[PDB]
Amino acid sequence: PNLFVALYDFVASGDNTLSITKGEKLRVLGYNQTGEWCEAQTKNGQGWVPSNYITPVN
């Protein structure tokens, strides 16, 4: 239930954010207080990405 796919490329902006590429899979650890940011893991590492830049995949 934690497997997601990226909707859009996102280039890290520092501050423990994680670059992700459209169509690539990621596993979600959780969210920040407002829900706007999502802490995720990919083959490239771990960090924060926008919550509405990702979606579940079976």
């Binding site: 909707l7 859009y8 996102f10 902006s13 501050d15 423990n16 954010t17 920040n32 207080q33 407002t34 706007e36 940011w37 802490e39 924060w48 990405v49 926008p50 919550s51 509405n52 830049y53």
Partner: peptide, 10 residues
């Protein structure tokens, strides 16, 4: 998480 909001979706 960052204290600033993320970028909006394209």
């Amino acid at each position: 998480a960052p204290t600033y909001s993320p970028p909006l979706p394209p």
